[PDB]
């Protein structure tokens, strides 16, 4: 297991994919044009995990970029490291969804899907040990949610033995203009619970809260968040871009993380917290690093884990520090809060350490938390949704595009059983 | 000869295998190119090594890992020339800490060349004793492909012996949550085949390198070196031949009173820092005393509250039979050492006269005389019950089962393997009863 | 053992499910390579297993598990006999405005298909014929019930309609009520030899190592004014296959077996969930569970489980799992 093929679609999804490829193309040492300008070979032992090699010291990001809006691609060309993308891999539609799921799933996405499948095909025809597929998108809009879920379904029925990883973001009436979002959300969840393997959850509400209270940015722009997400992405991909025994490939990653097939919704978190282009003079230590990255003030989804219990956790520390200090603080948080861990799964928190730190930091810490508290995030949507589907607003959009209307209440019964599933494994003692 | 054949599976088994053959070359005197100064191109070491044409002495080992990153270090390291290249067999996708991918999906396609190559080694020999299998109880590769591999070796080589070297997982360096599942599975399927399984608590090795070597966070390297030294003590009675050492198959017979009770706790005598210098050599009596302290033990357990069924002492270095007998007198009654009423309280001793060669810069302080005791005690059942607890919470809610079933296996295999485990525990009980 | 026994006979309890077990006799393969029979049934109420155990000291002894049930069919009785007490007292249900079902649970080689899909005097055919013989009767005809039938398979975690030659169907819920099998062709019949025709449409349209590799659902539906009144399902599942029995590799056969054992795992965890009542029973785990939801917790539902087990020593592990879950079913 080595090669990971990456894909970005939708406004939000393409944006965050760009931020990702920026920070990781710098950390791996690739210059903007596409030649290795690093220092340490630690950045090339597992470089093949995210780049194909065009002969001649050309590191081509094994990636694909899609949108139903013909514009979008412009924001790519202005991306400072955007020329490195392979020409064939640019597949951009020209209709546009306009915040409509069924337009992206049953209508126009149904037309561009087979155009993406062929570039994905010729991407897999040149991979030694193709791991799985790794996607970035958003749930409240039109293109990303729908066309994404359809793509995942077709890849799933053509590649059943390859890991299915998705980095999905959340709508909330704090950043979303329109309010057609509590529909596309529940649809996307309906497909994700049934077709994906791993799934990372990022709430726009959390990023707004962090940008306002911590970073003191009263007027949050739309890149202020992409910074915050790209950081977490480097943190959780460290286990796959650098060598190490823990979380080698994605299969191993899900193995120590997925207790039940459906429950696979994580709540990332990073410490410390910084704005853009602002380094840390008093860079953080260790007890504040782990004392922060397990508190809620640094989590990436609007979910207070102190209400729920952790099923599994995978902590990752980057930089140069003491190993004993790491494992000691880990177990200290564990046993001083053994009331927050399912005692019927033991050895549930796995922590690795990587040498190379992220950019702008000397010591960092990433968090990945499959908690039982994540149901609070799904009890919110099934509230914005049951309050809008009991009224049937905007249903002529979807239903008037080949969609069944009951494929909605299907998703309400599905998610409302999921909530009961996270509540199930919250009070089950080891009897 | 009376040949043997080593097999090394999984990350652990391959790395610890490299430490083992490292030490073998050091003690028996071979340089990484495979050449020996003293030999004539039928000796005690010609059981573990074969002679080629140009005196290029080459091991009798097959290395396997499903993900070639851990074996590629062999072909890049100092011993890349040492090996016949055809017996460094590798896969592509690691088993991903999944037993079922070892035993069924991934291993099926590679087992046949694994055994055509093991075959290619077996046709080199004139009278092979048995296979030495090195693997971990944890990772998917070492559990699955060893369970299947043994299921096959029992078909192709029924008359031959099969000795396990097993690596109990420690929570500190555990790379998975589902380690109990893998362990229980491979023990269940491997039991009726394997003849004698030496168990290594990684927790215990960690504690050893915490106390006597004073390393705060010991690397996998340190652990592999220590374990290698102990294995060299055990095999030494196979690889040398004085008039004072007997075959490991000679007193293997005395270590296993019942077919399912074949797990001898090991114990290794002097373990001292080469850094923390200034040291007086220990007498035979002192190391024979140390062979009974749970510190210098191999598995985390407590033999003082448990009964014994046998005892072996493999001394290496400077040891006179009378020194051993005297130390055995000082130990015999002076301690609360108990035998079952159905067993003679006798000791057999393998005096090997080669000293313990440690490692260049290897933080094992070199010593003149050492002892490695193999005690088949009933307290070893502790290490099983430490498993079946971490198991019987998870399997109480069937958490994580969906992967193993999702790669081929049924559910009932779990309830069966677990039930068989509890049966084994009750057997380590039935050993303790007496008569009248 | 075997003989020199059986003085005592069977006075049972009140169940929530007609749980029954069938023993098939050994065949040419298990006899040529002389396997042993380790199952006996002395009364139509007791399933005995002779678990060959061995102490630590190699002394061979017998763990004589005893399993009382609703009815125990031995290694002789034909499809008629099994139908008469498993599916027959269930025809009463659907005519009286009821929703009944019928399970075929066992291992691969236990005989589920042969009890349901015949060769073709299977409980499909027989149950249908007793549907059309009572619909002749005066007090049943005075309802003017129109008869329908469906026949579809779950394979690879997706739904395909065998009457509509392997077409993909969705599966939805909505307003609670029912689990709506969206897209299902519902063919009208008015006589027994219509049903036999649909039957040999599906039985040959099924995916098939000569064994039923997909979950078969065969419905017999009643509609008075068109509105639903009765629904009897007859289910032939795939057996819980070992995995320790190595298939000849194959890239799709391992897919099949794995998905089978995973659906059976989900079903199994739902059994062990109802047996102790977890307020969240995990029915949205697989398509199969999502289906059988109403077959269990339906408002006016009855149901029947026909368990099947092999008699050979080699099967004893599987057999004990199947019987153990059949015991945990009887509530
Ligand atoms: N003593 C020792 N133990 C090890 C070593 N490597 C792994 N382990 C143990 O093995 C367990 C994990 O299994 P691994 O051997 O790493 O996995 P694997 O055999 O390579 O199988 P895959 O990871 O699926 O490829 C952990 O609990 C470790 O304690 C090692 O080098 N030395
Ligand atoms: N009552 C019976 N008497 C004799 N043979 C029987 C009986 N019931 C079943 N069999 C035999 O069982 C064999 C296997 O039947 P079948 O039901 O297809 O296996 P299975 O349980 O369905 N395995 P699977 O296809 O995975 O569900 C048939 O070929 C019959 O010969
Ligand atoms: N953090 C962040 N959120 C975004 C961005 N773009 C869109 N969103 C969110 O995603 C939702 C849908 O917007 P959009 O991306 O245009 O829809 P889509 O592309 O069709 O999925 C909105 O509610 C936004 O809050 C972005 O660049 N950053
Ligand atoms: Mg490996
Ligand atoms: Mg069948």
Residue numbers in the entry:
A (entry chain D): 1 to 44, 47 to 360, 369 to 441
B (entry chain C): 1 to 41, 46 to 440
C (entry chain E): 204 to 213, 218 to 326, 335 to 423, 430 to 552
Paper text:
Kinesin-13 proteins are major MT-destabilizing factors in higher eukaryotes and a specialized class of motor proteins in the kinesin superfamily. Rather than moving directionally along MTs, kinesin-13s catalyze tubulin disassembly at MT ends. Human Kif2A is a 706-amino-acid kinesin-13 that functions as a homodimer in vivo. A monomeric motor domain construct that includes the kinesin-13-specific neck (Kif2A-NM; amino acids 153–553) exhibits the ability to catalytically depolymerize MTs in vitro, similar to that of the full-length dimeric kinesin-13 as previously reported.
The MR solution comprised one Kif2A-NM monomer bound to the concave side of a curved assembly of two αβ-tubulin dimers arranged head to tail and capped at the plus end by DARPin. The final structure was refined to a resolution of ~3.5 Å, giving electron density maps that show well-connected main chain density for all subunits of the Kif2A-NM–tubulin–DARPin complex. Notably, the N-terminal section (residues 157–195) of the neck of Kif2A can be seen interacting with one of the tubulin dimers (labeled α1β1; buried surface area = 915 Å2). The other dimer (labeled α2β2) is occupied by the Kif2A motor domain, which contains MgAMPPNP in the active site. Residues 160–185 form a well-defined helix (α0a) that runs antiparallel to helix H12 of β1-tubulin. Many of the positively charged residues in α0a juxtapose the large patch of negatively charged residues on the surface of β1-tubulin. The Lys262, Val263, Asp264 triplet (KVD motif) of Kif2A interacts with both β1-tubulin and α2-tubulin at the inter-dimer interface. Val263 inserts into a hydrophobic pocket formed by the non-polar atoms of Tyr262, Pro263, Arg264, Ile265, Asp431, Glu434, and Val435 of α2-tubulin, while the Cα and Cβ atoms of Asp264 of Kif2A are nearest to Tyr262 of α2-tubulin and Lys402 of β1-tubulin. The most striking change from isolated Kif2A involves a ~26° rotation of the α4 and α5 helices, allowing L12 to engage helix H12 of β2-tubulin. In contrast, the tubulin dimer bound by Kif2A’s neck is much more curved (15.3°), and there is an even larger bend at the inter-dimer interface (15.8°).
